[PDB]
């Protein structure tokens, strides 16, 4: 888990005009977002209030290191997803195409139309390259 904590450490010190190592909740979000997350303003409160009883609004590492020590529990499936991505990508080109998305689907029962299919690709597609790369496949599976 060295790298784990090591990762949370990298971003934490990336933005912190505090110096010693204490940020605010006005940026706590940006941190979790730059570190690959999309938390809702509702979740950024009920947590920064349970462990942070300081009432000062000051946050450091040991505190943050613990919050992440909870969220990263039933989501660390990074693996399973990455593997699934590879399952769609039959041609092994590194990207998921509509044709490919078709098979997986049809072979799972749901017979889709060339329309519906192309709809899913575009929806999941973020760069407009007309295909889904792992990074995209990831975002699409995150929420």
């Amino acid at each position: 888990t060295e790298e784990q904590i090591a990762e949370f450490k990298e971003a934490f010190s990336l933005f912190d005009k505090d110096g010693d190592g204490t940020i605010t909740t006005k940026e706590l979000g940006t941190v979790m977002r730059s570190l690959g997350q999309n938390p809702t303003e509702a979740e950024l409160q009920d947590m920064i209030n349970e462990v942070d009883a300081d009432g000062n609004g000051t946050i450091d590492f040991p505190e943050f290191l613990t919050m992440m020590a909870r969220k990263m529990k039933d989501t660390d499936s990074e693996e399973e997803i990455r593997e699934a991505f590879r399952v769609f990508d039959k041609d092994g080109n590194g990207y998921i195409s509509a044709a490919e998305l078709r098979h997986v689907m049809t072979n799972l029962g749901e017979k889709l139309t060339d329309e519906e299919v192309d709809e899913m690709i575009r929806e999941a597609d973020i760069d407009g390259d007309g295909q889904v790369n792992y990074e995209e496949f990831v975002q699409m599976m995150t929420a």
Partner: protein, 470 residues
């Protein structure tokens, strides 16, 4: 360039009857079955109903001498013969099997049945030689082209004994006279029965259909009947019931469907007359992440029922690619591949398409008053983007990349940058270059960067670029 049928089965090591019996399951369940090599000198023992070693026994089998086919306690009598570290690591494993599993596993003298000696004579492993009498006891020498040990067998009980040759020394630097050859055994109904190599499965690739069949008709419906997530509702019903694996002790890490697939394989063999229980005791090599074995020849049985034997790792990769991972079949490769396996520090490489097209970019730092550090610059993949049109995106995208092109990036002469970072950003730049031409060619980077001057808040140059769409 792979062997087929008879010839391949010959090299697979599986007991013919068992393999034939396997075609049935491969076919019926439309799923590829891949086995790792099987000690050829173990085959016959297996067929004759000898029990196979499970995860509670890690000693390596032997492929020479009278004890060939079994699991010698003295691992220098195993296939690892002559490899000090392997022998030693092997023994410790046996010692452990003997102690941490008392009454479960044990060792017993090796007895070579009248028929076995014969089998060995054909295979040209040992030869029953001249007689010998030692304390009023009758023995018959058993030879082998080996130079360190000397073997003999008792006429009375048929126990085999061995000793080190004259002046010769064991790998571990030992030397001893005549003494029994002990072999790993498991407890069966209070009696200790000898063990032999099992059928270590390499991988299992089921017809994508099959994993569906696995899903409960209900949980599936609650997302397939236009509940459009769906797009991601499928993948997850694909993961939990097709990709997901978990520990299990008797068997190792594996998957529900795999577990089942196990049972059928086993049952499937009993029918041929196999007495000694199971031949497939645990999950596939693809989940053997701590001590991965990289074998040269893989034995594959396709859903057709044919027999194929890859000749070498590079080949096994192709086969899997062309006929499985690229043909609607469920497959995942050992997570240790392309990494240093923790256990034995193995470094087995495998083709990861994801790393294939790795000329892209995201949260790096994966690499590890007055707004200058803040701002939305490292978020190329802006989720909120399905609102734009495929054209806007590819158009805006390039912009975001270039945004990062000259971000805080041109900091190429901040104090003293190590060739390590530059290399990265460089590479990254080499990525952003290609991660654009594509968006372009779809519908027409070293095109026009002179028509770009970022010397102000990205918002100011935003209009610029949109005018550069020409």
């Amino acid at each position: 360039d792979v062997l087929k049928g008879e010839k391949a089965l010959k090299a697979s090591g599986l007991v013919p009857e068992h393999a034939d019996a396997f075609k049935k399951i491969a076919r019926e369940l439309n799923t590829y079955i891949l086995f790792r090599p099987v000690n050829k000198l173990a085959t016959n023992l297996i067929k004759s109903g000898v029990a196979t070693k499970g995860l509670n026994v890690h000693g390596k089998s032997s492929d020479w001498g009278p004890v060939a086919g079994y699991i010698p306690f003295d691992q220098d009598l195993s296939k690892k013969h002559g490899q000090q570290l392997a022998v030693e690591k092997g023994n410790l494993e046996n010692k452990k099997s003997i102690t941490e599993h008392e009454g479960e596993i044990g060792k017993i003298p090796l007895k070579l049945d009248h028929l076995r000696i014969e089998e060995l004579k054909e295979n040209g492993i040992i030869l029953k030689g001249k007689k010998e009498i030692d304390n009023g006891k009758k023995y018959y020498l058993l030879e082998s082209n080996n130079q360190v040990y000397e073997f003999r067998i008792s006429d009375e009980n048929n126990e085999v004994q061995y000793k080190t040759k004259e002046g010769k020394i064991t790998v571990l630097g030992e030397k001893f006279n005549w003494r029994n050859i002990e072999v790993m055994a498991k407890n069966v109904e209070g009696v200790l029965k000898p063990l032999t190599a099992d059928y270590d499965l390499f991988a299992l690739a089921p017809s994508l259909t099959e994993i569906k069949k696995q899903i409960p008709q209900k949980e599936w419906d609650k997302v397939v009947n236009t509940p459009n997530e769906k797009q991601k509702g499928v993948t997850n019903l694909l993961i939990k019931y097709g990709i997901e694996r978990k520990p299990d002790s008797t068997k190792g890490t594996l998957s529900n469907w795999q577990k089942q697939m196990l049972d059928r394989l086993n049952e499937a063999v009993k029918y041929t007359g196999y007495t000694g229980g199971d031949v497939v005791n645990h999950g596939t090599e693809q989940d053997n992440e701590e001590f991965p074995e990289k074998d040269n020849e893989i034995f594959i049985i396709n859903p057709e029922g044919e027999f194929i034997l890859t000749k070498n790792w590079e080949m096994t990769g192709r086969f899997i690619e062309k006929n499985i991972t690229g043909k609607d079949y469920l497959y995942y490769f050992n997570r240790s591949y392309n990494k240093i396996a923790p256990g034995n520090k193995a470094y087995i490489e495998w083709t990861d398409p994801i790393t294939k097209a790795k000329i892209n970019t995201i949260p790096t730092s994966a690499e590890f008053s007055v707004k200058k550090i803040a701002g939305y610059l490292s978020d190329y993949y802006n989720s909120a983007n399905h609102i734009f049109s495929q054209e806007k995106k590819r158009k805006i995208s390039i912009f975001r990349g270039i945004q990062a092109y000259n971000e805080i990036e041109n900091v190429l002469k901040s104090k003293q940058i190590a060739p390590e970072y530059k290399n990265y950003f460089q590479y990254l730049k080499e990525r952003i270059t290609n991660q654009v031409q594509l968006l372009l060619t779809h519908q027409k980077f070293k095109l026009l960067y002179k028509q770009l001057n970022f010397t102000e808040n990205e918002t100011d140059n935003f209009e610029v670029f949109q005018k550069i769409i020409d």
